[PDB]
Amino acid sequence: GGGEIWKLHEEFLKKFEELLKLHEERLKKM
Amino acid sequence: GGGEIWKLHEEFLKKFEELLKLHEERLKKM
Amino acid sequence: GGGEIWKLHEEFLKKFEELLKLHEERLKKM
Amino acid sequence: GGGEIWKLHEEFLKKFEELLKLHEERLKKM
Ligand SMILES: [Hg+2]
Ligand SMILES: [Hg+2]
């Protein structure tokens, strides 16, 4: 039910934050 | 699924939009 | 950098928001 | 200049689409 759905979203939320964080990171290193 | 699972999907798209605006802010100042 | 590089940043945040809405659409129908 | 910035953004735009695409993929397999 929502339990699995929640975990799946929490997982990609985290991935997406890593992606953003990575983006601005390289944007500086540049 | 049913409109129940939808509340969950909406809940996170909202957190997604939040991350994006913060990201925009960081770039702006950057 | 200067407001020139800003045009670029804005250009892609816009494409980012576009991907998100499409994603919302898919989930909605899903 | 904008050339590098552009490529960097095009790179994460692509990554972000893979992420979204992956998300809805697992959302179905569920
Ligand atoms: Hg999502
Ligand atoms: Hg970006």
mmCIF file of N, CA and C and ligand atoms in Angstrom:
data_model
loop_
_atom_site.group_PDB
_atom_site.id
_atom_site.type_symbol
_atom_site.label_atom_id
_atom_site.label_comp_id
_atom_site.label_asym_id
_atom_site.label_seq_id
_atom_site.Cartn_x
_atom_site.Cartn_y
_atom_site.Cartn_z
ATOM 1 N N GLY A 1 0.863 -1.235 0.000
ATOM 2 C CA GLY A 1 0.000 0.000 0.000
ATOM 3 C C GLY A 1 0.868 1.242 0.000
ATOM 4 N N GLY A 2 0.446 2.262 0.739
ATOM 5 C CA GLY A 2 1.201 3.501 0.778
ATOM 6 C C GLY A 2 2.596 3.343 1.350
ATOM 7 N N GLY A 3 2.779 2.321 2.175
ATOM 8 C CA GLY A 3 4.070 2.084 2.792
ATOM 9 C C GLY A 3 5.161 1.893 1.764
ATOM 10 N N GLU A 4 4.920 1.041 0.774
ATOM 11 C CA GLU A 4 5.916 0.822 -0.267
ATOM 12 C C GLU A 4 6.050 2.071 -1.125
ATOM 13 N N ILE A 5 4.918 2.665 -1.497
ATOM 14 C CA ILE A 5 4.923 3.860 -2.308
ATOM 15 C C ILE A 5 5.748 4.947 -1.646
ATOM 16 N N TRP A 6 5.521 5.135 -0.351
ATOM 17 C CA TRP A 6 6.244 6.150 0.396
ATOM 18 C C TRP A 6 7.742 5.921 0.289
ATOM 19 N N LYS A 7 8.184 4.711 0.602
ATOM 20 C CA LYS A 7 9.592 4.384 0.533
ATOM 21 C C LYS A 7 10.176 4.598 -0.847
ATOM 22 N N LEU A 8 9.410 4.282 -1.884
ATOM 23 C CA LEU A 8 9.904 4.471 -3.241
ATOM 24 C C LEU A 8 10.108 5.961 -3.550
ATOM 25 N N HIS A 9 9.188 6.799 -3.095
ATOM 26 C CA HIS A 9 9.305 8.219 -3.329
ATOM 27 C C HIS A 9 10.426 8.798 -2.488
ATOM 28 N N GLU A 10 10.578 8.314 -1.263
ATOM 29 C CA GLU A 10 11.607 8.856 -0.402
ATOM 30 C C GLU A 10 12.958 8.543 -0.990
ATOM 31 N N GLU A 11 13.021 7.436 -1.719
ATOM 32 C CA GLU A 11 14.254 6.979 -2.355
ATOM 33 C C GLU A 11 14.694 7.857 -3.520
ATOM 34 N N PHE A 12 13.739 8.269 -4.347
ATOM 35 C CA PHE A 12 14.042 9.110 -5.502
ATOM 36 C C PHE A 12 14.159 10.582 -5.145
ATOM 37 N N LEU A 13 13.580 10.944 -4.012
ATOM 38 C CA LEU A 13 13.657 12.302 -3.524
ATOM 39 C C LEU A 13 15.152 12.487 -3.183
ATOM 40 N N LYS A 14 15.682 11.498 -2.475
ATOM 41 C CA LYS A 14 17.065 11.474 -2.053
ATOM 42 C C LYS A 14 17.971 11.441 -3.280
ATOM 43 N N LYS A 15 17.675 10.582 -4.247
ATOM 44 C CA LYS A 15 18.482 10.551 -5.455
ATOM 45 C C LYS A 15 18.466 11.907 -6.166
ATOM 46 N N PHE A 16 17.282 12.482 -6.297
ATOM 47 C CA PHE A 16 17.143 13.755 -6.953
ATOM 48 C C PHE A 16 17.935 14.837 -6.214
ATOM 49 N N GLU A 17 18.012 14.771 -4.888
ATOM 50 C CA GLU A 17 18.755 15.794 -4.159
ATOM 51 C C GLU A 17 20.240 15.646 -4.430
ATOM 52 N N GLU A 18 20.687 14.404 -4.563
ATOM 53 C CA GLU A 18 22.084 14.112 -4.843
ATOM 54 C C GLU A 18 22.426 14.670 -6.216
ATOM 55 N N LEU A 19 21.504 14.501 -7.151
ATOM 56 C CA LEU A 19 21.692 14.996 -8.499
ATOM 57 C C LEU A 19 21.829 16.530 -8.512
ATOM 58 N N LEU A 20 20.898 17.230 -7.863
ATOM 59 C CA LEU A 20 20.959 18.676 -7.790
ATOM 60 C C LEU A 20 22.254 19.113 -7.144
ATOM 61 N N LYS A 21 22.542 18.514 -5.994
ATOM 62 C CA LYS A 21 23.743 18.802 -5.225
ATOM 63 C C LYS A 21 24.995 18.585 -6.055
ATOM 64 N N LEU A 22 24.951 17.562 -6.891
ATOM 65 C CA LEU A 22 26.071 17.238 -7.761
ATOM 66 C C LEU A 22 26.180 18.313 -8.849
ATOM 67 N N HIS A 23 25.041 18.705 -9.410
ATOM 68 C CA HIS A 23 25.010 19.715 -10.461
ATOM 69 C C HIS A 23 25.704 20.996 -10.016
ATOM 70 N N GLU A 24 25.192 21.634 -8.973
ATOM 71 C CA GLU A 24 25.791 22.877 -8.505
ATOM 72 C C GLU A 24 27.227 22.699 -8.057
ATOM 73 N N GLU A 25 27.589 21.472 -7.694
ATOM 74 C CA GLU A 25 28.955 21.177 -7.270
ATOM 75 C C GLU A 25 29.873 21.360 -8.484
ATOM 76 N N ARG A 26 29.568 20.678 -9.587
ATOM 77 C CA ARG A 26 30.370 20.796 -10.802
ATOM 78 C C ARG A 26 30.282 22.192 -11.413
ATOM 79 N N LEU A 27 29.194 22.890 -11.136
ATOM 80 C CA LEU A 27 29.005 24.224 -11.676
ATOM 81 C C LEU A 27 30.018 25.162 -11.033
ATOM 82 N N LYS A 28 30.461 24.817 -9.830
ATOM 83 C CA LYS A 28 31.434 25.634 -9.121
ATOM 84 C C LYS A 28 32.824 25.245 -9.583
ATOM 85 N N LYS A 29 33.098 23.943 -9.573
ATOM 86 C CA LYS A 29 34.376 23.407 -10.003
ATOM 87 C C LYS A 29 34.694 23.870 -11.411
ATOM 88 N N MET A 30 33.741 24.552 -12.032
ATOM 89 C CA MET A 30 33.921 25.054 -13.383
ATOM 90 C C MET A 30 34.142 26.563 -13.434
ATOM 91 N N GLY B 1 -2.975 3.713 -8.721
ATOM 92 C CA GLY B 1 -4.087 3.178 -7.891
ATOM 93 C C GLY B 1 -5.202 4.196 -7.700
ATOM 94 N N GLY B 2 -5.981 4.017 -6.638
ATOM 95 C CA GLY B 2 -7.076 4.928 -6.347
ATOM 96 C C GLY B 2 -6.616 6.264 -5.785
ATOM 97 N N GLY B 3 -7.525 7.238 -5.768
ATOM 98 C CA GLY B 3 -7.214 8.563 -5.260
ATOM 99 C C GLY B 3 -6.498 8.644 -3.920
ATOM 100 N N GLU B 4 -6.250 7.503 -3.289
ATOM 101 C CA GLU B 4 -5.547 7.496 -2.012
ATOM 102 C C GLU B 4 -4.051 7.618 -2.330
ATOM 103 N N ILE B 5 -3.592 6.758 -3.231
ATOM 104 C CA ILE B 5 -2.205 6.736 -3.651
ATOM 105 C C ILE B 5 -1.853 8.057 -4.316
ATOM 106 N N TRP B 6 -2.869 8.756 -4.805
ATOM 107 C CA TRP B 6 -2.658 10.040 -5.463
ATOM 108 C C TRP B 6 -2.183 11.105 -4.475
ATOM 109 N N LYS B 7 -2.714 11.063 -3.261
ATOM 110 C CA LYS B 7 -2.333 12.014 -2.235
ATOM 111 C C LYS B 7 -0.829 11.900 -2.012
ATOM 112 N N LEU B 8 -0.326 10.672 -2.049
ATOM 113 C CA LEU B 8 1.086 10.427 -1.851
ATOM 114 C C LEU B 8 1.909 10.990 -2.979
ATOM 115 N N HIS B 9 1.458 10.758 -4.207
ATOM 116 C CA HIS B 9 2.171 11.246 -5.383
ATOM 117 C C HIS B 9 2.257 12.761 -5.342
ATOM 118 N N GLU B 10 1.156 13.394 -4.972
ATOM 119 C CA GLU B 10 1.109 14.844 -4.910
ATOM 120 C C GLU B 10 2.044 15.370 -3.832
ATOM 121 N N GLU B 11 2.054 14.678 -2.706
ATOM 122 C CA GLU B 11 2.876 15.054 -1.572
ATOM 123 C C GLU B 11 4.337 15.172 -1.934
ATOM 124 N N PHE B 12 4.808 14.293 -2.810
ATOM 125 C CA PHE B 12 6.199 14.334 -3.177
ATOM 126 C C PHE B 12 6.529 15.210 -4.367
ATOM 127 N N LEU B 13 5.575 15.414 -5.268
ATOM 128 C CA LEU B 13 5.835 16.284 -6.410
ATOM 129 C C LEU B 13 6.043 17.647 -5.798
ATOM 130 N N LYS B 14 5.339 17.909 -4.699
ATOM 131 C CA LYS B 14 5.443 19.180 -3.995
ATOM 132 C C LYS B 14 6.854 19.349 -3.407
ATOM 133 N N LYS B 15 7.418 18.281 -2.845
ATOM 134 C CA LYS B 15 8.766 18.340 -2.284
ATOM 135 C C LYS B 15 9.759 18.458 -3.430
ATOM 136 N N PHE B 16 9.356 17.989 -4.597
ATOM 137 C CA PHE B 16 10.221 18.013 -5.760
ATOM 138 C C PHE B 16 10.335 19.431 -6.242
ATOM 139 N N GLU B 17 9.209 20.132 -6.265
ATOM 140 C CA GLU B 17 9.184 21.515 -6.710
ATOM 141 C C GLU B 17 9.953 22.373 -5.741
ATOM 142 N N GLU B 18 9.912 22.003 -4.470
ATOM 143 C CA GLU B 18 10.614 22.745 -3.448
ATOM 144 C C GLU B 18 12.112 22.655 -3.683
ATOM 145 N N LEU B 19 12.615 21.450 -3.948
ATOM 146 C CA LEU B 19 14.046 21.258 -4.183
ATOM 147 C C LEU B 19 14.498 22.078 -5.384
ATOM 148 N N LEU B 20 13.670 22.125 -6.422
ATOM 149 C CA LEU B 20 13.990 22.864 -7.634
ATOM 150 C C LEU B 20 14.120 24.350 -7.405
ATOM 151 N N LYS B 21 13.200 24.931 -6.641
ATOM 152 C CA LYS B 21 13.266 26.364 -6.344
ATOM 153 C C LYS B 21 14.516 26.674 -5.526
ATOM 154 N N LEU B 22 14.856 25.812 -4.568
ATOM 155 C CA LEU B 22 16.051 26.039 -3.770
ATOM 156 C C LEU B 22 17.213 25.986 -4.727
ATOM 157 N N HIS B 23 17.162 25.045 -5.658
ATOM 158 C CA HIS B 23 18.261 24.885 -6.592
ATOM 159 C C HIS B 23 18.387 26.163 -7.405
ATOM 160 N N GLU B 24 17.253 26.735 -7.793
ATOM 161 C CA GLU B 24 17.262 27.962 -8.589
ATOM 162 C C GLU B 24 17.907 29.072 -7.781
ATOM 163 N N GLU B 25 17.529 29.168 -6.517
ATOM 164 C CA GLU B 25 18.092 30.177 -5.635
ATOM 165 C C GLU B 25 19.622 30.067 -5.586
ATOM 166 N N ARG B 26 20.129 28.868 -5.341
ATOM 167 C CA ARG B 26 21.562 28.673 -5.273
ATOM 168 C C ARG B 26 22.239 29.156 -6.554
ATOM 169 N N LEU B 27 21.684 28.799 -7.711
ATOM 170 C CA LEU B 27 22.261 29.219 -8.983
ATOM 171 C C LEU B 27 22.198 30.736 -9.115
ATOM 172 N N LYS B 28 21.055 31.314 -8.762
ATOM 173 C CA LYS B 28 20.880 32.760 -8.838
ATOM 174 C C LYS B 28 22.038 33.426 -8.109
ATOM 175 N N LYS B 29 22.189 33.135 -6.823
ATOM 176 C CA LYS B 29 23.282 33.724 -6.056
ATOM 177 C C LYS B 29 24.634 33.374 -6.649
ATOM 178 N N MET B 30 24.759 32.141 -7.134
ATOM 179 C CA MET B 30 25.993 31.662 -7.733
ATOM 180 C C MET B 30 26.448 32.571 -8.871
ATOM 181 N N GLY C 1 28.297 33.344 -12.587
ATOM 182 C CA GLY C 1 28.895 34.439 -13.400
ATOM 183 C C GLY C 1 27.934 35.608 -13.582
ATOM 184 N N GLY C 2 28.158 36.395 -14.630
ATOM 185 C CA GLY C 2 27.305 37.544 -14.911
ATOM 186 C C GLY C 2 25.939 37.157 -15.463
ATOM 187 N N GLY C 3 25.017 38.117 -15.460
ATOM 188 C CA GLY C 3 23.670 37.877 -15.950
ATOM 189 C C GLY C 3 23.532 37.203 -17.310
ATOM 190 N N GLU C 4 24.653 36.881 -17.949
ATOM 191 C CA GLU C 4 24.614 36.196 -19.240
ATOM 192 C C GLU C 4 24.411 34.708 -18.943
ATOM 193 N N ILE C 5 25.254 34.184 -18.054
ATOM 194 C CA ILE C 5 25.196 32.790 -17.640
ATOM 195 C C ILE C 5 23.861 32.507 -16.966
ATOM 196 N N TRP C 6 23.226 33.555 -16.458
ATOM 197 C CA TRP C 6 21.936 33.418 -15.797
ATOM 198 C C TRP C 6 20.844 33.024 -16.782
ATOM 199 N N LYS C 7 20.926 33.542 -18.002
ATOM 200 C CA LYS C 7 19.936 33.233 -19.025
ATOM 201 C C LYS C 7 19.948 31.734 -19.271
ATOM 202 N N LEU C 8 21.144 31.162 -19.243
ATOM 203 C CA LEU C 8 21.309 29.732 -19.455
ATOM 204 C C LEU C 8 20.706 28.929 -18.308
ATOM 205 N N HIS C 9 20.977 29.362 -17.080
ATOM 206 C CA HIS C 9 20.459 28.677 -15.903
ATOM 207 C C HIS C 9 18.942 28.674 -15.932
ATOM 208 N N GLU C 10 18.374 29.809 -16.293
ATOM 209 C CA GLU C 10 16.934 29.948 -16.344
ATOM 210 C C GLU C 10 16.351 29.072 -17.429
ATOM 211 N N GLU C 11 17.044 29.028 -18.559
ATOM 212 C CA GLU C 11 16.605 28.224 -19.696
ATOM 213 C C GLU C 11 16.398 26.756 -19.344
ATOM 214 N N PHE C 12 17.266 26.221 -18.491
ATOM 215 C CA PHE C 12 17.159 24.831 -18.103
ATOM 216 C C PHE C 12 16.279 24.532 -16.899
ATOM 217 N N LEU C 13 16.127 25.490 -15.996
ATOM 218 C CA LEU C 13 15.232 25.282 -14.877
ATOM 219 C C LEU C 13 13.845 25.161 -15.473
ATOM 220 N N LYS C 14 13.618 25.875 -16.571
ATOM 221 C CA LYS C 14 12.344 25.857 -17.278
ATOM 222 C C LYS C 14 12.095 24.471 -17.886
ATOM 223 N N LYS C 15 13.132 23.863 -18.460
ATOM 224 C CA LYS C 15 13.016 22.519 -19.029
ATOM 225 C C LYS C 15 12.861 21.503 -17.875
ATOM 226 N N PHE C 16 13.378 21.866 -16.707
ATOM 227 C CA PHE C 16 13.277 21.010 -15.549
ATOM 228 C C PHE C 16 11.852 20.979 -15.053
ATOM 229 N N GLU C 17 11.222 22.143 -15.007
ATOM 230 C CA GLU C 17 9.854 22.214 -14.545
ATOM 231 C C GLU C 17 8.955 21.487 -15.534
ATOM 232 N N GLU C 18 9.334 21.509 -16.807
ATOM 233 C CA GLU C 18 8.530 20.875 -17.837
ATOM 234 C C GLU C 18 8.540 19.367 -17.622
ATOM 235 N N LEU C 19 9.722 18.805 -17.375
ATOM 236 C CA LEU C 19 9.845 17.367 -17.142
ATOM 237 C C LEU C 19 9.011 16.941 -15.919
ATOM 238 N N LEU C 20 9.007 17.769 -14.884
ATOM 239 C CA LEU C 20 8.250 17.478 -13.686
ATOM 240 C C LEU C 20 6.755 17.418 -13.913
ATOM 241 N N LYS C 21 6.213 18.382 -14.657
ATOM 242 C CA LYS C 21 4.785 18.391 -14.935
ATOM 243 C C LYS C 21 4.404 17.173 -15.763
ATOM 244 N N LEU C 22 5.258 16.789 -16.710
ATOM 245 C CA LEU C 22 4.945 15.637 -17.542
ATOM 246 C C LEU C 22 4.927 14.441 -16.618
ATOM 247 N N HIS C 23 5.888 14.397 -15.705
ATOM 248 C CA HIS C 23 5.964 13.312 -14.754
ATOM 249 C C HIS C 23 4.699 13.277 -13.925
ATOM 250 N N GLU C 24 4.210 14.443 -13.505
ATOM 251 C CA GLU C 24 2.981 14.481 -12.712
ATOM 252 C C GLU C 24 1.848 13.904 -13.531
ATOM 253 N N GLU C 25 1.760 14.324 -14.782
ATOM 254 C CA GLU C 25 0.727 13.828 -15.666
ATOM 255 C C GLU C 25 0.723 12.299 -15.729
ATOM 256 N N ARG C 26 1.877 11.722 -16.012
ATOM 257 C CA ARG C 26 1.986 10.276 -16.075
ATOM 258 C C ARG C 26 1.465 9.610 -14.793
ATOM 259 N N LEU C 27 1.877 10.120 -13.635
ATOM 260 C CA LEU C 27 1.429 9.544 -12.375
ATOM 261 C C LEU C 27 -0.077 9.707 -12.229
ATOM 262 N N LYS C 28 -0.594 10.876 -12.585
ATOM 263 C CA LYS C 28 -2.021 11.137 -12.486
ATOM 264 C C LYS C 28 -2.763 10.035 -13.207
ATOM 265 N N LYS C 29 -2.457 9.848 -14.486
ATOM 266 C CA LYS C 29 -3.134 8.817 -15.269
ATOM 267 C C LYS C 29 -2.855 7.440 -14.694
ATOM 268 N N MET C 30 -1.632 7.248 -14.213
ATOM 269 C CA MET C 30 -1.220 5.981 -13.632
ATOM 270 C C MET C 30 -2.153 5.569 -12.492
ATOM 271 N N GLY D 1 32.882 29.259 -21.300
ATOM 272 C CA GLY D 1 31.764 30.260 -21.370
ATOM 273 C C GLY D 1 30.471 29.470 -21.370
ATOM 274 N N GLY D 2 29.466 29.963 -22.090
ATOM 275 C CA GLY D 2 28.188 29.273 -22.137
ATOM 276 C C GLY D 2 28.261 27.877 -22.732
ATOM 277 N N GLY D 3 29.280 27.645 -23.549
ATOM 278 C CA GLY D 3 29.442 26.347 -24.179
ATOM 279 C C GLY D 3 29.570 25.225 -23.169
ATOM 280 N N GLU D 4 30.431 25.411 -22.173
ATOM 281 C CA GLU D 4 30.613 24.404 -21.138
ATOM 282 C C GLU D 4 29.357 24.334 -20.268
ATOM 283 N N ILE D 5 28.847 25.487 -19.867
ATOM 284 C CA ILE D 5 27.652 25.527 -19.039
ATOM 285 C C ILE D 5 26.525 24.763 -19.731
ATOM 286 N N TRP D 6 26.325 25.032 -21.019
ATOM 287 C CA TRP D 6 25.269 24.369 -21.764
ATOM 288 C C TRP D 6 25.414 22.857 -21.689
ATOM 289 N N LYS D 7 26.595 22.348 -22.009
ATOM 290 C CA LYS D 7 26.824 20.918 -21.975
ATOM 291 C C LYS D 7 26.561 20.341 -20.602
ATOM 292 N N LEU D 8 26.954 21.062 -19.558
ATOM 293 C CA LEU D 8 26.765 20.579 -18.191
ATOM 294 C C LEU D 8 25.287 20.440 -17.889
ATOM 295 N N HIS D 9 24.500 21.423 -18.306
ATOM 296 C CA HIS D 9 23.062 21.393 -18.071
ATOM 297 C C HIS D 9 22.390 20.330 -18.920
ATOM 298 N N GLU D 10 22.837 20.183 -20.157
ATOM 299 C CA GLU D 10 22.243 19.179 -21.013
ATOM 300 C C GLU D 10 22.495 17.784 -20.424
ATOM 301 N N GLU D 11 23.628 17.634 -19.740
ATOM 302 C CA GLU D 11 24.027 16.384 -19.122
ATOM 303 C C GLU D 11 23.130 15.995 -17.943
ATOM 304 N N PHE D 12 22.775 16.970 -17.104
ATOM 305 C CA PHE D 12 21.932 16.697 -15.956
ATOM 306 C C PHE D 12 20.459 16.676 -16.293
ATOM 307 N N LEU D 13 20.124 17.243 -17.435
ATOM 308 C CA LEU D 13 18.754 17.254 -17.894
ATOM 309 C C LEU D 13 18.470 15.802 -18.266
ATOM 310 N N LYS D 14 19.425 15.233 -18.984
ATOM 311 C CA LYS D 14 19.359 13.854 -19.425
ATOM 312 C C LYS D 14 19.319 12.936 -18.180
ATOM 313 N N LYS D 15 20.223 13.153 -17.222
ATOM 314 C CA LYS D 15 20.238 12.342 -16.009
ATOM 315 C C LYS D 15 18.902 12.420 -15.285
ATOM 316 N N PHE D 16 18.387 13.630 -15.150
ATOM 317 C CA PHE D 16 17.126 13.833 -14.471
ATOM 318 C C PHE D 16 15.982 13.116 -15.201
ATOM 319 N N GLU D 17 16.028 13.056 -16.531
ATOM 320 C CA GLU D 17 14.952 12.368 -17.260
ATOM 321 C C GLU D 17 15.045 10.868 -17.002
ATOM 322 N N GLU D 18 16.273 10.368 -16.880
ATOM 323 C CA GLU D 18 16.486 8.958 -16.622
ATOM 324 C C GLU D 18 15.918 8.630 -15.260
ATOM 325 N N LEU D 19 16.132 9.538 -14.319
ATOM 326 C CA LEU D 19 15.654 9.355 -12.967
ATOM 327 C C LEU D 19 14.135 9.283 -12.938
ATOM 328 N N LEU D 20 13.483 10.239 -13.587
ATOM 329 C CA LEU D 20 12.023 10.273 -13.615
ATOM 330 C C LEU D 20 11.508 9.018 -14.263
ATOM 331 N N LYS D 21 12.080 8.713 -15.422
ATOM 332 C CA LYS D 21 11.702 7.550 -16.218
ATOM 333 C C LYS D 21 11.851 6.291 -15.390
ATOM 334 N N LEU D 22 12.891 6.260 -14.570
ATOM 335 C CA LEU D 22 13.156 5.113 -13.729
ATOM 336 C C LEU D 22 12.094 5.042 -12.630
ATOM 337 N N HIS D 23 11.769 6.190 -12.053
ATOM 338 C CA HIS D 23 10.780 6.243 -10.995
ATOM 339 C C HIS D 23 9.456 5.645 -11.427
ATOM 340 N N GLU D 24 8.847 6.198 -12.473
ATOM 341 C CA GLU D 24 7.566 5.675 -12.941
ATOM 342 C C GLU D 24 7.654 4.229 -13.406
ATOM 343 N N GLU D 25 8.857 3.800 -13.757
ATOM 344 C CA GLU D 25 9.068 2.438 -14.204
ATOM 345 C C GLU D 25 8.833 1.529 -13.003
ATOM 346 N N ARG D 26 9.544 1.785 -11.911
ATOM 347 C CA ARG D 26 9.394 0.988 -10.695
ATOM 348 C C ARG D 26 8.009 1.126 -10.074
ATOM 349 N N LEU D 27 7.373 2.257 -10.319
ATOM 350 C CA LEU D 27 6.059 2.513 -9.772
ATOM 351 C C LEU D 27 5.060 1.571 -10.418
ATOM 352 N N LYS D 28 5.379 1.111 -11.625
ATOM 353 C CA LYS D 28 4.491 0.202 -12.349
ATOM 354 C C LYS D 28 4.803 -1.221 -11.915
ATOM 355 N N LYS D 29 6.090 -1.568 -11.942
ATOM 356 C CA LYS D 29 6.552 -2.890 -11.538
ATOM 357 C C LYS D 29 6.074 -3.194 -10.128
ATOM 358 N N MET D 30 5.474 -2.203 -9.485
ATOM 359 C CA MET D 30 4.972 -2.360 -8.127
ATOM 360 C C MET D 30 3.453 -2.522 -8.107
HETATM 361 HG HG HG E 1 8.210 11.119 -8.468
HETATM 362 HG HG HG E 2 20.231 22.846 -13.118
#
